[PDB]
Design a protein around this motif. Sequence first.
Motif, PDB file in Angstrom:
ATOM      1  N   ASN A 182       0.808  -1.212   0.000  1.00 40.10           N
ATOM      2  CA  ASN A 182       0.000   0.000   0.000  1.00 40.10           C
ATOM      3  C   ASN A 182       0.847   1.270   0.000  1.00 40.10           C
ATOM      4  O   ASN A 182       0.506   2.252  -0.657  1.00 40.10           O
ATOM      5  CB  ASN A 182      -0.938   0.001   1.212  1.00 40.10           C
ATOM      6  N   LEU A 183       1.950   1.238   0.740  1.00 44.89           N
ATOM      7  CA  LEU A 183       2.808   2.410   0.896  1.00 44.89           C
ATOM      8  C   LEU A 183       3.562   2.745  -0.386  1.00 44.89           C
ATOM      9  O   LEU A 183       3.170   3.643  -1.130  1.00 44.89           O
ATOM     10  CB  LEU A 183       3.794   2.202   2.048  1.00 44.89           C
ATOM     11  N   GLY A 184       4.648   2.020  -0.638  1.00 44.79           N
ATOM     12  CA  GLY A 184       5.447   2.237  -1.830  1.00 44.79           C
ATOM     13  C   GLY A 184       6.748   1.458  -1.810  1.00 44.79           C
ATOM     14  O   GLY A 184       6.938   0.569  -0.980  1.00 44.79           O
ATOM     15  N   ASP A 185       7.647   1.795  -2.729  1.00 49.53           N
ATOM     16  CA  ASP A 185       8.942   1.129  -2.813  1.00 49.53           C
ATOM     17  C   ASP A 185       9.933   1.722  -1.819  1.00 49.53           C
ATOM     18  O   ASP A 185       9.628   2.693  -1.128  1.00 49.53           O
ATOM     19  CB  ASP A 185       9.500   1.226  -4.232  1.00 49.53           C
ATOM     20  N   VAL A 186      11.123   1.136  -1.757  1.00 49.41           N
ATOM     21  CA  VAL A 186      12.140   1.563  -0.803  1.00 49.41           C
ATOM     22  C   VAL A 186      12.601   2.996  -1.060  1.00 49.41           C
ATOM     23  O   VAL A 186      12.656   3.443  -2.205  1.00 49.41           O
ATOM     24  CB  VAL A 186      13.361   0.620  -0.832  1.00 49.41           C
ATOM     25  N   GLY A 187      12.918   3.715   0.014  1.00 52.70           N
ATOM     26  CA  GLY A 187      13.489   5.045  -0.093  1.00 52.70           C
ATOM     27  C   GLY A 187      12.481   6.173  -0.203  1.00 52.70           C
ATOM     28  O   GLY A 187      12.838   7.343  -0.065  1.00 52.70           O
ATOM     29  N   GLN A 188      11.223   5.832  -0.451  1.00 55.85           N
ATOM     30  CA  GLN A 188      10.179   6.842  -0.600  1.00 55.85           C
ATOM     31  C   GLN A 188       9.792   7.458   0.740  1.00 55.85           C
ATOM     32  O   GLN A 188      10.096   6.910   1.799  1.00 55.85           O
ATOM     33  CB  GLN A 188       8.945   6.251  -1.286  1.00 55.85           C
ATOM     34  N   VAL A 189       9.119   8.602   0.686  1.00 52.88           N
ATOM     35  CA  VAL A 189       8.664   9.279   1.894  1.00 52.88           C
ATOM     36  C   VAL A 189       7.165   9.546   1.838  1.00 52.88           C
ATOM     37  O   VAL A 189       6.702  10.401   1.083  1.00 52.88           O
ATOM     38  CB  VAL A 189       9.410  10.604   2.114  1.00 52.88           C
ATOM     39  N   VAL A 190       6.412   8.803   2.642  1.00 51.11           N
ATOM     40  CA  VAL A 190       4.961   8.936   2.688  1.00 51.11           C
ATOM     41  C   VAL A 190       4.482   9.094   4.126  1.00 51.11           C
ATOM     42  O   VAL A 190       5.008   8.456   5.038  1.00 51.11           O
ATOM     43  CB  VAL A 190       4.264   7.717   2.054  1.00 51.11           C
ATOM     44  N   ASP A 191       3.486   9.952   4.324  1.00 53.58           N
ATOM     45  CA  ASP A 191       2.927  10.172   5.652  1.00 53.58           C
ATOM     46  C   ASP A 191       1.731   9.264   5.920  1.00 53.58           C
ATOM     47  O   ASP A 191       0.699   9.358   5.255  1.00 53.58           O
ATOM     48  CB  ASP A 191       2.528  11.636   5.839  1.00 53.58           C
ATOM     49  N   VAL A 192       1.881   8.384   6.905  1.00 57.55           N
ATOM     50  CA  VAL A 192       0.834   7.438   7.257  1.00 57.55           C
ATOM     51  C   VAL A 192       0.223   7.794   8.602  1.00 57.55           C
ATOM     52  O   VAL A 192       0.654   8.743   9.255  1.00 57.55           O
ATOM     53  CB  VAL A 192       1.385   6.010   7.341  1.00 57.55           C
ATOM     54  N   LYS A 193      -0.781   7.026   9.011  1.00 56.00           N
ATOM     55  CA  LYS A 193      -1.416   7.228  10.308  1.00 56.00           C
ATOM     56  C   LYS A 193      -0.435   6.944  11.437  1.00 56.00           C
ATOM     57  O   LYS A 193       0.307   5.964  11.388  1.00 56.00           O
ATOM     58  CB  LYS A 193      -2.660   6.349  10.445  1.00 56.00           C
ATOM     59  N   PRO A 194      -0.432   7.806  12.464  1.00 56.40           N
ATOM     60  CA  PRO A 194       0.507   7.718  13.587  1.00 56.40           C
ATOM     61  C   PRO A 194       0.715   6.286  14.058  1.00 56.40           C
ATOM     62  O   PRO A 194       1.806   5.737  13.914  1.00 56.40           O
ATOM     63  CB  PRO A 194      -0.189   8.531  14.676  1.00 56.40           C
ATOM     64  N   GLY A 195      -0.333   5.691  14.613  1.00 62.42           N
ATOM     65  CA  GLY A 195      -0.243   4.355  15.166  1.00 62.42           C
ATOM     66  C   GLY A 195       0.346   3.346  14.203  1.00 62.42           C
ATOM     67  O   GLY A 195       1.220   2.563  14.572  1.00 62.42           O
ATOM     68  N   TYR A 196      -0.132   3.368  12.965  1.00 59.89           N
ATOM     69  CA  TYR A 196       0.291   2.399  11.961  1.00 59.89           C
ATOM     70  C   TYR A 196       1.806   2.349  11.827  1.00 59.89           C
ATOM     71  O   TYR A 196       2.369   1.322  11.457  1.00 59.89           O
ATOM     72  CB  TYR A 196      -0.349   2.712  10.609  1.00 59.89           C
ATOM     73  N   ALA A 197       2.459   3.462  12.139  1.00 60.67           N
ATOM     74  CA  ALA A 197       3.910   3.556  12.027  1.00 60.67           C
ATOM     75  C   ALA A 197       4.584   3.360  13.379  1.00 60.67           C
ATOM     76  O   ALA A 197       5.714   2.878  13.457  1.00 60.67           O
ATOM     77  CB  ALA A 197       4.304   4.896  11.435  1.00 60.67           C
ATOM     78  N   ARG A 198       3.879   3.738  14.440  1.00 60.08           N
ATOM     79  CA  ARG A 198       4.434   3.692  15.787  1.00 60.08           C
ATOM     80  C   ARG A 198       4.343   2.296  16.391  1.00 60.08           C
ATOM     81  O   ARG A 198       5.136   1.936  17.259  1.00 60.08           O
ATOM     82  CB  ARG A 198       3.714   4.695  16.689  1.00 60.08           C
ATOM     83  N   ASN A 199       3.372   1.516  15.927  1.00 61.56           N
ATOM     84  CA  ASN A 199       3.116   0.195  16.490  1.00 61.56           C
ATOM     85  C   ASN A 199       3.302  -0.954  15.496  1.00 61.56           C
ATOM     86  O   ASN A 199       3.013  -2.108  15.814  1.00 61.56           O
ATOM     87  CB  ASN A 199       1.708   0.139  17.092  1.00 61.56           C
ATOM     88  N   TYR A 200       3.788  -0.642  14.299  1.00 62.23           N
ATOM     89  CA  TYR A 200       3.944  -1.657  13.262  1.00 62.23           C
ATOM     90  C   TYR A 200       5.195  -1.420  12.424  1.00 62.23           C
ATOM     91  O   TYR A 200       6.183  -2.142  12.550  1.00 62.23           O
ATOM     92  CB  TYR A 200       2.702  -1.692  12.370  1.00 62.23           C
ATOM     93  N   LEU A 201       5.146  -0.402  11.570  1.00 58.66           N
ATOM     94  CA  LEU A 201       6.267  -0.087  10.695  1.00 58.66           C
ATOM     95  C   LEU A 201       7.550   0.073  11.493  1.00 58.66           C
ATOM     96  O   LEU A 201       8.418  -0.798  11.469  1.00 58.66           O
ATOM     97  CB  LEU A 201       5.989   1.188   9.897  1.00 58.66           C
ATOM     98  N   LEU A 202       7.658   1.186  12.207  1.00 62.23           N
ATOM     99  CA  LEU A 202       8.864   1.497  12.968  1.00 62.23           C
ATOM    100  C   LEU A 202       9.302   0.361  13.903  1.00 62.23           C
ATOM    101  O   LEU A 202      10.475  -0.020  13.909  1.00 62.23           O
ATOM    102  CB  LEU A 202       8.684   2.805  13.745  1.00 62.23           C
ATOM    103  N   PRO A 203       8.363  -0.184  14.695  1.00 63.92           N
ATOM    104  CA  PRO A 203       8.726  -1.261  15.625  1.00 63.92           C
ATOM    105  C   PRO A 203       9.266  -2.506  14.922  1.00 63.92           C
ATOM    106  O   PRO A 203      10.287  -3.047  15.344  1.00 63.92           O
ATOM    107  CB  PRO A 203       7.399  -1.589  16.316  1.00 63.92           C
ATOM    108  N   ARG A 204       8.589  -2.948  13.867  1.00 69.04           N
ATOM    109  CA  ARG A 204       8.966  -4.185  13.189  1.00 69.04           C
ATOM    110  C   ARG A 204      10.047  -3.967  12.133  1.00 69.04           C
ATOM    111  O   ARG A 204      10.318  -4.849  11.321  1.00 69.04           O
ATOM    112  CB  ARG A 204       7.739  -4.864  12.574  1.00 69.04           C
TER     113      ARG A 204
END
Lengths: 145, 88
Positions: A11-33
């Motif tokens: 859903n987001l994109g390929d490597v190196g891109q910069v996209v703004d997602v929902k806070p939690g989705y990044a704080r509890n999934y993306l960034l953590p994992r």
Amino acid sequence: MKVILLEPLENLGDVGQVVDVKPGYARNYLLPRGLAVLATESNLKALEARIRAQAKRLAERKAEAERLKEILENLTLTIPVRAGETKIYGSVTAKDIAEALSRQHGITIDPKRLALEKPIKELGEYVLTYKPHPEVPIQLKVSVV
Amino acid sequence: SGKRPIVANSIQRRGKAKREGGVGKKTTGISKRRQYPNLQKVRVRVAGQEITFRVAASHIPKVYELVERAKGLRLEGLSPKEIKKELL
RNA sequence: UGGGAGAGGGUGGUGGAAUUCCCGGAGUAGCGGUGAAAUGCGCAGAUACCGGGAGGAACGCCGAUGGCGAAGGCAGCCAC
RNA sequence: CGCGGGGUGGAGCAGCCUGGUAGCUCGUCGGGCUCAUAACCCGAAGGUCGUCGGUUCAAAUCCGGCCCCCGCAACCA
RNA sequence: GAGCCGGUAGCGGGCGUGGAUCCCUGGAUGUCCGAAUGGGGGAACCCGGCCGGCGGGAACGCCGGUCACCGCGCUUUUUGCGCGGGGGGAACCUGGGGAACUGAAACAUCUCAGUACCCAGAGGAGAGGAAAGAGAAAUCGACUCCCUGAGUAGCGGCGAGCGAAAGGGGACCAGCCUAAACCGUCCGGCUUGUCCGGGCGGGGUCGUGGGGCCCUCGGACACCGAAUCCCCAGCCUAGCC
RNA sequence: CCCCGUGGUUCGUGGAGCCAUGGGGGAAUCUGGGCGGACCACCGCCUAAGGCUAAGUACUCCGGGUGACCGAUAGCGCACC
RNA sequence: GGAGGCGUAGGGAAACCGAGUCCGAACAGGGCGUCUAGUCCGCGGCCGUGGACCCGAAACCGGGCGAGCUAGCCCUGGCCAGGGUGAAGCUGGGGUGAGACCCAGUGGAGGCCCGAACCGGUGGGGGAUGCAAACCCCUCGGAUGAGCUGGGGCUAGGAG
RNA sequence: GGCGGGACCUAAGGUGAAGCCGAAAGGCGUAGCCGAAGGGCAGCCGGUUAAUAUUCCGGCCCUUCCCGCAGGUGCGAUGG
RNA sequence: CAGGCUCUGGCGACUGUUUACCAAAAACACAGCUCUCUGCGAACUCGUAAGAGGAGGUAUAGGGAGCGACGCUUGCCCGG
RNA sequence: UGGCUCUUGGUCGCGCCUGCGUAGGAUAGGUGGGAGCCUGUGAACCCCCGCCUCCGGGUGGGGGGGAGGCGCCGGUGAAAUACCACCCUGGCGCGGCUGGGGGCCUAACCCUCGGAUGGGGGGACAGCGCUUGGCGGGCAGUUUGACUGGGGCGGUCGCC
RNA sequence: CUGACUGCGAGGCCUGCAAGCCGAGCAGGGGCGAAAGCCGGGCCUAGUGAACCGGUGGUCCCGUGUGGAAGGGCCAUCGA
Ligand SMILES: [Mg+2]
Ligand SMILES: [Mg+2]
Ligand SMILES: [Mg+2]
Ligand SMILES: [Mg+2]
Ligand SMILES: [Mg+2]
Ligand SMILES: [Mg+2]
Ligand SMILES: [Mg+2]
Ligand SMILES: [Mg+2]
Ligand SMILES: [Mg+2]
Ligand SMILES: [Mg+2]
Ligand SMILES: [Mg+2]
Ligand SMILES: [Mg+2]
Ligand SMILES: [Mg+2]
Ligand SMILES: [Mg+2]
Ligand SMILES: [Mg+2]
Ligand SMILES: [Mg+2]
Ligand SMILES: [Mg+2]
Ligand SMILES: [Mg+2]
Ligand SMILES: [Mg+2]
Ligand SMILES: [Mg+2]
Ligand SMILES: [Mg+2]
Ligand SMILES: [Mg+2]
Ligand SMILES: [Mg+2]
Ligand SMILES: [Mg+2]
Ligand SMILES: [Mg+2]
Ligand SMILES: [Mg+2]
Ligand SMILES: [Mg+2]
Ligand SMILES: [Mg+2]
Ligand SMILES: [Mg+2]
Ligand SMILES: [Mg+2]
Ligand SMILES: [Mg+2]
Ligand SMILES: [Mg+2]
Ligand SMILES: [Mg+2]
Ligand SMILES: [Mg+2]
Ligand SMILES: [Mg+2]
Ligand SMILES: [Mg+2]
Ligand SMILES: [Mg+2]
Ligand SMILES: [Mg+2]
Ligand SMILES: [Mg+2]
Ligand SMILES: [Mg+2]
Ligand SMILES: [Mg+2]
Ligand SMILES: [Mg+2]
Ligand SMILES: [Mg+2]
Ligand SMILES: [Mg+2]
Ligand SMILES: [Mg+2]
Ligand SMILES: [Mg+2]
Ligand SMILES: [Mg+2]
Ligand SMILES: [Mg+2]
Ligand SMILES: [Mg+2]
Ligand SMILES: [Mg+2]
Ligand SMILES: [Mg+2]
Ligand SMILES: [Mg+2]
Ligand SMILES: [Mg+2]
Ligand SMILES: [Mg+2]
Ligand SMILES: [Mg+2]
Ligand SMILES: [Mg+2]
Ligand SMILES: [Mg+2]
Ligand SMILES: [Mg+2]
Ligand SMILES: [Mg+2]
Ligand SMILES: [Mg+2]
Ligand SMILES: [Mg+2]
Ligand SMILES: [Mg+2]
Ligand SMILES: [Mg+2]
Ligand SMILES: [Mg+2]
Ligand SMILES: [Mg+2]
Ligand SMILES: [Mg+2]
Ligand SMILES: [Mg+2]
Ligand SMILES: [Mg+2]
Ligand SMILES: [Mg+2]
Ligand SMILES: [Mg+2]
Ligand SMILES: [Mg+2]
Ligand SMILES: [Mg+2]
Ligand SMILES: [Mg+2]
Ligand SMILES: [Mg+2]
Ligand SMILES: [Mg+2]
Ligand SMILES: [Mg+2]
Ligand SMILES: [Mg+2]
Ligand SMILES: [Mg+2]
Ligand SMILES: [Mg+2]
Ligand SMILES: [Mg+2]
Ligand SMILES: [Mg+2]
Ligand SMILES: [Mg+2]
Ligand SMILES: [Mg+2]
Ligand SMILES: [Mg+2]
Ligand SMILES: [Mg+2]
Ligand SMILES: [Mg+2]
Ligand SMILES: [Mg+2]
Ligand SMILES: [Mg+2]
Ligand SMILES: [Mg+2]
Ligand SMILES: [Mg+2]
Ligand SMILES: [Mg+2]
Ligand SMILES: [Mg+2]
Ligand SMILES: [Mg+2]
Ligand SMILES: [Mg+2]
Ligand SMILES: [Mg+2]
Ligand SMILES: [Mg+2]
Ligand SMILES: [Mg+2]
Ligand SMILES: [Mg+2]
Ligand SMILES: [Mg+2]
Ligand SMILES: [Mg+2]
Ligand SMILES: [Mg+2]
Ligand SMILES: [Mg+2]
Ligand SMILES: [Mg+2]
Ligand SMILES: [Mg+2]
Ligand SMILES: [Mg+2]
Ligand SMILES: [Mg+2]
Ligand SMILES: [Mg+2]
Ligand SMILES: [Mg+2]
Ligand SMILES: [Mg+2]
Ligand SMILES: [Mg+2]
Ligand SMILES: [Mg+2]
Ligand SMILES: [Mg+2]
Ligand SMILES: [Mg+2]
Ligand SMILES: [Mg+2]
Ligand SMILES: [Mg+2]
Ligand SMILES: [Mg+2]
Ligand SMILES: [Mg+2]
Ligand SMILES: [Mg+2]
Ligand SMILES: [Mg+2]
Ligand SMILES: [Mg+2]
Ligand SMILES: [Mg+2]
Ligand SMILES: [Mg+2]
Ligand SMILES: [Mg+2]
Ligand SMILES: [Mg+2]
Ligand SMILES: [Mg+2]
Ligand SMILES: [Mg+2]
Ligand SMILES: [Mg+2]
Ligand SMILES: [Mg+2]
Ligand SMILES: [Mg+2]
Ligand SMILES: [Mg+2]
Ligand SMILES: [Mg+2]
Ligand SMILES: [Mg+2]
Ligand SMILES: [Mg+2]
Ligand SMILES: [Mg+2]
Ligand SMILES: [Mg+2]
Ligand SMILES: [Mg+2]
Ligand SMILES: [Mg+2]
Ligand SMILES: [Mg+2]
Ligand SMILES: [Mg+2]
Ligand SMILES: [Mg+2]
Ligand SMILES: [Mg+2]
Ligand SMILES: [Mg+2]
Ligand SMILES: [Mg+2]
Ligand SMILES: [Mg+2]
Ligand SMILES: [Mg+2]
Ligand SMILES: [Mg+2]
Ligand SMILES: [Mg+2]
Ligand SMILES: [Mg+2]
Ligand SMILES: [Mg+2]
Ligand SMILES: [Mg+2]
Ligand SMILES: [Mg+2]
Ligand SMILES: [Mg+2]
Ligand SMILES: [Mg+2]
Ligand SMILES: [Mg+2]
Ligand SMILES: [Mg+2]
Ligand SMILES: [Mg+2]
Ligand SMILES: [Mg+2]
Ligand SMILES: [Mg+2]
Ligand SMILES: [Mg+2]
Ligand SMILES: [Mg+2]
Ligand SMILES: [Mg+2]
Ligand SMILES: [Mg+2]
Ligand SMILES: [Mg+2]
Ligand SMILES: [Mg+2]
Ligand SMILES: [Mg+2]
Ligand SMILES: [Mg+2]
Ligand SMILES: [Mg+2]
Ligand SMILES: [Mg+2]
Ligand SMILES: [Mg+2]
Ligand SMILES: [Mg+2]
Ligand SMILES: [Mg+2]
Ligand SMILES: [Mg+2]
Ligand SMILES: [Mg+2]
Ligand SMILES: [Mg+2]
Ligand SMILES: [Mg+2]
Ligand SMILES: [Mg+2]
Ligand SMILES: [Mg+2]
Ligand SMILES: [Mg+2]
Ligand SMILES: [Mg+2]
Ligand SMILES: [Mg+2]
Ligand SMILES: [Mg+2]
Ligand SMILES: [Mg+2]
Ligand SMILES: [Mg+2]
Ligand SMILES: [Mg+2]
Ligand SMILES: [Mg+2]
Ligand SMILES: [Mg+2]
Ligand SMILES: [Mg+2]
Ligand SMILES: [Mg+2]
Ligand SMILES: [Mg+2]
Ligand SMILES: [Mg+2]
Ligand SMILES: [Mg+2]
Ligand SMILES: [Mg+2]
Ligand SMILES: [Mg+2]
Ligand SMILES: [Mg+2]
Ligand SMILES: [Mg+2]
Ligand SMILES: [Mg+2]
Ligand SMILES: [Mg+2]
Ligand SMILES: [Mg+2]
Ligand SMILES: [Mg+2]
Ligand SMILES: [Mg+2]
Ligand SMILES: [Mg+2]
Ligand SMILES: [Mg+2]
Ligand SMILES: [Mg+2]
Ligand SMILES: [Mg+2]
Ligand SMILES: [Mg+2]
Ligand SMILES: [Mg+2]
Ligand SMILES: [Mg+2]
Ligand SMILES: [Mg+2]
Ligand SMILES: [Mg+2]
Ligand SMILES: [Mg+2]
Ligand SMILES: [Mg+2]
Ligand SMILES: [Mg+2]
Ligand SMILES: [Mg+2]
Ligand SMILES: [Mg+2]
Ligand SMILES: [Mg+2]
Ligand SMILES: [Mg+2]
Ligand SMILES: [Mg+2]
Ligand SMILES: [Mg+2]
Ligand SMILES: [Mg+2]
Ligand SMILES: [Mg+2]
Ligand SMILES: [Mg+2]
Ligand SMILES: [Mg+2]
């Protein structure tokens, strides 16, 4: 929140891109994992390094294949071999080429990059092809004597 | 409590119930109330081990932002509490 | 000794039908009920119909001028 | 005082929305019929549609104001 | 500079001009308790680890040192080392929390009141302090405290009450450090990059805005100067004519 | 900064600013940003979101000085173990 | 030491005007105001704000101290002379198809009975500046239980 | 040393490393620790003092520890 | 030392409990009846919270309410 | 406080479209531009479909087809039907914007399990923070007039 | 025909305060009558409510550095 994904995300994109997602989705999934990283003013900088580096890195690698483009195009490669009447005695592969090329002049090339699989077993001249850069090939004139 | 990068001691203030019109007149009924600060728990990896932050809602990012500054730090070897302190 | 008939009795298990209830589907102004009508039930979606489920009680046709037991009494089905 | 919903025969309601249709129930009178009330069946009188006004070919209908009821939250020196 | 062995004589026995008693200054000794701190506990009691010592001393006892906990730094971790804290203090002070009586001739807003009290913290003081101020003067110029402004402006079931500042007059008078831009360094992260960020040092501190990097200026001899450090004057801690 | 809930101020919702902040949205770096009592314009003021700072001021456990202060039912509760 | 204060001007909400001014169109009327007056200190009478002549509640509020009394509970101990009654069960025998059940013997149940200690405190008498801020004599209830009791411990003020 | 208490044990309860909460003070609480008329624990008769006595004395009897020793054995714990 | 007895009615079944210090009762408590909440991190209770009780219990259990052994029995009224 | 997915209302412009009392040839939604125009930027007529529905017509895609196909007007009516301009009722499609509804998920969060940088259950719910309204003697502060042949009950309270 | 007028008010009733009550005459302007003259509601004595709070219209006023706005004052009038 602005983030930097270092992984092919659907859903987001390929490597190196910069996209703004929902806070939690990044704080509890993306960034953590370990998929993306909080794109701070810090990482935005280190990202410019990733860009500029890789950029002038291959831009200078294509700028060097620009020198072999000028000289390997206006020069014939005479190969002193033995031959019966049509076909060659020994046999010239990609080694007998990058070899006598590094000797007759001093040019450093790999028999790997040189676009040829056929072990030349005939006398005469041909027009080979070398691949130093993916988008800037060089036709290396041949001359199997 | 509220002891985190936030530092928001829940302070009490007045909560008054008013009957009135607004553009006719106005009166009251006053009382005392304790206003707590929205405070949630934040668990995060951070080098070895894990670590919890009884922080407020306002200063949530401040934590993960700090975790960033933590990469530029050298830590290890059984550091449950000690991480927090040495964590700014 | 050998055979037979039977809703005779008690125990455990079990089958379909139908009623009501609940869920889901579709559908709308009436349903129900009497001699007649009302009370009641339904536009918050009833009645009628379709699918899934829960539960209890009684066992259609076979069934009779029938059989069985002392009387009361005894019926779907299988085993003891 | 501000908001919105309506006034439809002796009475209530559908018509209103998105005008071309006063209709429905009961009462009531006469007719059919019955042992009798009733059920049920035929026909009939009664509504400027609360009012005034506007647009339209036509206004219960859409709209402005006026009278009244009912609903709504709020208000009271 | 003549007596003295507290109050306090008596019993008893001594001391002093080889200058006591007595007064000051510094030092020594200071059982056990108490923040109490090796551990326990019903304060002044109870038991104990380790090093060393005493006694025939292995048992046992005694003596000397030592062992609480929390914070910051050192320890790359654990184990240790150093610096500090704890608790008390009449009143005073800031902060955190915070009544009711009472008054309004009732009472609920309001009042008492940020009063009483509680708690934490500081010190001879505290607080506050150089402007994102004040306020109408193209005016002032940190903060604090006194007088005044003023029972004014204004606040108020416009009730009861409550009640400020500018400015002016006085006391005292002081102004500095830093973060960030920018340059250098040591460490590990890693996606290894002309970088990320940690610490360190240089740099910089502002309102007519200031600073940074580059260019010109000669850009330094100079000047300003401690709220720190050293010395001394004087001064308090016994006395003398 | 804006809004919701409040404290301080002379300010009790009031035309309610300013200062502080519990919740929410959420920015810029001098073409920045707060303020001079809603709000706009104009004119002027001031640089927030780090810290430090003597003196003048408070008090009187303590020592001293003095009193149109008491003189043992007074004066500290207590002149006196 | 003149900062400051009172006074030398008033009228009007104000703008403002001024020996006047406000209403109003007013050269009417009328309200208020000019014709001059004070301040400073001492003392005394009275009033305001203070505890405010003096003595006195019932109350309320803050913080703290108590369950060594009294109540409940937790923990671990202890105590309850003697006599009576005689359930279940059990055994034997009878009984029946078996059994139910019956009888005898055994047995020793019970918020059972009587009655001390023990606990309590019904009725009367005394006592009433008491032996005593709850006692004494007679009498009476409970007395293996929801019993009594020692020691250890917990719970409290709109709280237990 | 022999009775009672401690250099043993644990009960409610208290305390309280860890841990959790609270504006401060504080509140909760595992482990351990504290806590007893409970568990464990080696003295019986008699004499003597103006006054003490399983305490002094007599008679008879006993426990713990340390050291050394003879003999026996895989000895050994806060753990099963 | 050491019950006076009998008949008959009211209340409460009963042993029990209470107003220390004027009331021991017909009062309260009780077994048993009914209603109601509660599916477990239970409802309810104390606490700001952490937590605790409930309960190392689980609808034959737990909370609340009323009634009060046992027998017969408990009628009609949801308009408020 | 998160992932995905189905579904649905609001809403702004734009695209396409439904709207039939008779008369007039008709089924003229409004007012008007405008007698010219649509067609090889291939029509009249046929054949298949989505859809509105007054029951008859209209409108979009595609194919056969090959040269026509509409209209003012007189007419009649409230007005007129080449094509065109905008807008009203309601609808369909687009993306922005924003809200409601359902289902699955796992990672926040909670519960739980021989300790787990893990496994299981719940799950964007719950809990908690701010704000909103409501119920709320469980608790708090407080009101509950006076005259009166004592008070209470009763009567009265201003004015003529 | 609208004197149920505006700006006024010498004097006086009443009276603790406050409130109430009569009113000549002046000015503007207006009605009726030829005029004199009368009219500032009703033959008269009850038909009502300080202040605060706020509403609606109006306005020579105020308006926080300045123009302006918010808000307010003033005249009118509203809710016991
Ligand atoms: Mg930044
Ligand atoms: Mg050549
Ligand atoms: Mg050759
Ligand atoms: Mg947040
Ligand atoms: Mg936020
Ligand atoms: Mg460290
Ligand atoms: Mg036979
Ligand atoms: Mg048979
Ligand atoms: Mg069967
Ligand atoms: Mg019908
Ligand atoms: Mg009905
Ligand atoms: Mg209906
Ligand atoms: Mg028969
Ligand atoms: Mg509305
Ligand atoms: Mg409505
Ligand atoms: Mg009807
Ligand atoms: Mg009829
Ligand atoms: Mg009408
Ligand atoms: Mg009409
Ligand atoms: Mg109302
Ligand atoms: Mg002496
Ligand atoms: Mg000497
Ligand atoms: Mg001395
Ligand atoms: Mg000395
Ligand atoms: Mg101590
Ligand atoms: Mg020490
Ligand atoms: Mg030693
Ligand atoms: Mg020893
Ligand atoms: Mg020692
Ligand atoms: Mg350390
Ligand atoms: Mg080391
Ligand atoms: Mg270190
Ligand atoms: Mg360490
Ligand atoms: Mg380190
Ligand atoms: Mg050291
Ligand atoms: Mg120290
Ligand atoms: Mg201290
Ligand atoms: Mg101290
Ligand atoms: Mg003080
Ligand atoms: Mg204070
Ligand atoms: Mg009072
Ligand atoms: Mg009172
Ligand atoms: Mg009060
Ligand atoms: Mg108050
Ligand atoms: Mg106050
Ligand atoms: Mg305070
Ligand atoms: Mg304070
Ligand atoms: Mg202190
Ligand atoms: Mg200071
Ligand atoms: Mg300071
Ligand atoms: Mg100003
Ligand atoms: Mg001074
Ligand atoms: Mg003053
Ligand atoms: Mg008032
Ligand atoms: Mg005050
Ligand atoms: Mg105040
Ligand atoms: Mg104040
Ligand atoms: Mg001043
Ligand atoms: Mg930094
Ligand atoms: Mg930096
Ligand atoms: Mg560097
Ligand atoms: Mg630096
Ligand atoms: Mg420096
Ligand atoms: Mg410097
Ligand atoms: Mg500059
Ligand atoms: Mg100079
Ligand atoms: Mg010099
Ligand atoms: Mg110099
Ligand atoms: Mg000198
Ligand atoms: Mg001197
Ligand atoms: Mg001296
Ligand atoms: Mg001297
Ligand atoms: Mg602001
Ligand atoms: Mg502003
Ligand atoms: Mg905030
Ligand atoms: Mg958000
Ligand atoms: Mg810049
Ligand atoms: Mg300013
Ligand atoms: Mg401002
Ligand atoms: Mg202003
Ligand atoms: Mg400008
Ligand atoms: Mg600064
Ligand atoms: Mg002084
Ligand atoms: Mg003295
Ligand atoms: Mg003195
Ligand atoms: Mg004297
Ligand atoms: Mg004298
Ligand atoms: Mg005395
Ligand atoms: Mg004046
Ligand atoms: Mg004035
Ligand atoms: Mg006037
Ligand atoms: Mg005059
Ligand atoms: Mg004059
Ligand atoms: Mg004069
Ligand atoms: Mg005068
Ligand atoms: Mg005078
Ligand atoms: Mg004089
Ligand atoms: Mg005097
Ligand atoms: Mg006087
Ligand atoms: Mg006076
Ligand atoms: Mg006085
Ligand atoms: Mg008295
Ligand atoms: Mg008094
Ligand atoms: Mg009170
Ligand atoms: Mg007790
Ligand atoms: Mg005994
Ligand atoms: Mg005995
Ligand atoms: Mg006995
Ligand atoms: Mg017997
Ligand atoms: Mg027997
Ligand atoms: Mg037998
Ligand atoms: Mg037998
Ligand atoms: Mg037998
Ligand atoms: Mg038998
Ligand atoms: Mg029998
Ligand atoms: Mg038997
Ligand atoms: Mg017997
Ligand atoms: Mg027997
Ligand atoms: Mg016997
Ligand atoms: Mg008994
Ligand atoms: Mg008895
Ligand atoms: Mg006793
Ligand atoms: Mg007694
Ligand atoms: Mg009696
Ligand atoms: Mg008596
Ligand atoms: Mg009894
Ligand atoms: Mg007895
Ligand atoms: Mg006991
Ligand atoms: Mg206590
Ligand atoms: Mg020892
Ligand atoms: Mg324990
Ligand atoms: Mg504790
Ligand atoms: Mg505790
Ligand atoms: Mg414990
Ligand atoms: Mg203890
Ligand atoms: Mg204890
Ligand atoms: Mg013992
Ligand atoms: Mg013995
Ligand atoms: Mg002797
Ligand atoms: Mg002996
Ligand atoms: Mg031996
Ligand atoms: Mg072995
Ligand atoms: Mg072994
Ligand atoms: Mg063994
Ligand atoms: Mg082995
Ligand atoms: Mg062994
Ligand atoms: Mg009777
Ligand atoms: Mg009884
Ligand atoms: Mg009884
Ligand atoms: Mg009974
Ligand atoms: Mg009864
Ligand atoms: Mg009791
Ligand atoms: Mg008792
Ligand atoms: Mg008793
Ligand atoms: Mg009594
Ligand atoms: Mg009695
Ligand atoms: Mg009794
Ligand atoms: Mg009772
Ligand atoms: Mg009872
Ligand atoms: Mg019963
Ligand atoms: Mg609670
Ligand atoms: Mg629990
Ligand atoms: Mg439990
Ligand atoms: Mg348990
Ligand atoms: Mg139950
Ligand atoms: Mg009863
Ligand atoms: Mg009864
Ligand atoms: Mg019944
Ligand atoms: Mg009943
Ligand atoms: Mg009946
Ligand atoms: Mg009901
Ligand atoms: Mg009902
Ligand atoms: Mg959500
Ligand atoms: Mg949400
Ligand atoms: Mg969000
Ligand atoms: Mg959301
Ligand atoms: Mg959706
Ligand atoms: Mg849809
Ligand atoms: Mg949309
Ligand atoms: Mg016709
Ligand atoms: Mg026709
Ligand atoms: Mg065209
Ligand atoms: Mg086709
Ligand atoms: Mg085809
Ligand atoms: Mg076609
Ligand atoms: Mg075609
Ligand atoms: Mg065809
Ligand atoms: Mg024409
Ligand atoms: Mg539309
Ligand atoms: Mg969208
Ligand atoms: Mg969106
Ligand atoms: Mg769902
Ligand atoms: Mg699920
Ligand atoms: Mg799954
Ligand atoms: Mg799952
Ligand atoms: Mg999970
Ligand atoms: Mg799963
Ligand atoms: Mg989170
Ligand atoms: Mg668990
Ligand atoms: Mg887990
Ligand atoms: Mg859901
Ligand atoms: Mg939620
Ligand atoms: Mg609320
Ligand atoms: Mg209630
Ligand atoms: Mg009350
Ligand atoms: Mg109430
Ligand atoms: Mg009061
Ligand atoms: Mg009242
Ligand atoms: Mg009275
Ligand atoms: Mg009178
Ligand atoms: Mg009377
Ligand atoms: Mg005229
Ligand atoms: Mg009058
Ligand atoms: Mg005239
Ligand atoms: Mg008249
Ligand atoms: Mg009249
Ligand atoms: Mg009259
Ligand atoms: Mg004017
Ligand atoms: Mg004007
Ligand atoms: Mg002006
Ligand atoms: Mg105005
Ligand atoms: Mg009115």
